[PDB]
């Protein structure tokens, strides 16, 4: 799977597009934090010291949906193989309506090391009807996170969201 195989998707995938063992670079996300860039509020943070740890569910408030910009801090370790052109394409849908796709290129990845990246999400302006529907139907908003190293898919994580606070 390459970036061209996901950049036009109009629905959540019916399954994971790669197996865990496709992660030959041993990329392991060890911290993920999201902060509202307009208030400094930390909206979510997690650290670690059958899905297989690839699905996460979020519980945010209805105010999330009116945010302008969110900053995500990612920490990850990397194994001993050099990692070049590490890229995430992450696509968010409500009921299979594409809300936004974010395409992030990680900076340089130091092998055999903990690395950090900051991703800035600029939220799409959502119509009032969408925001009300997404608040009313928790977990029907979902995302696919597709991670590529040298244009090949190495990790695929899934998420779903509630805004029912």
């Amino acid at each position: 799977i390459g970036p061209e195989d996901v950049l036009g998707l109009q629905r959540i995938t019916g399954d994971y597009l790669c197996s865990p063992e496709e992660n030959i670079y041993k990329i392991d996300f060890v911290r993920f934090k999201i902060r509202d860039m307009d208030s400094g509020t930390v909206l979510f943070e997690i650290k670690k010291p059958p899905n297989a740890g690839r699905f996460v569910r979020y519980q945010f408030t209805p105010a999330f949906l009116r945010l302008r910009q969110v900053g995500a801090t990612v920490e990850f370790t990397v194994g001993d193989k050099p990692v070049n052109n590490f890229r995430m394409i992450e696509r968010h849908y409500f009921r299979n309506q594409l809300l936004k796709s974010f395409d992030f290129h990680f900076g340089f990845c130091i092998p055999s090391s903990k690395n950090t990246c900051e991703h800035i999400y600029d939220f799409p302006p959502l119509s009032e009807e969408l925001i009300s529907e997404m608040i009313r139907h928790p977990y029907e908003t979902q995302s696919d996170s597709f991670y590529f190293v040298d244009d090949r898919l190495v990790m695929h994580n899934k998420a779903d969201y509630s805004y029912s606070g």
Binding site: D28, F29, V30, R31, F32, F44, I46, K47, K48, N51, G53, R54, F55, V56, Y58, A72, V74, F76, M88, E90, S143, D144, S145, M155, H156, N157, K158, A159
Partner: peptide, 7 residues
């Protein structure tokens, strides 16, 4: 989805 792994 980076939040999945971090748990």
């Amino acid at each position: 989805g980076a939040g999945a792994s971090a748990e």
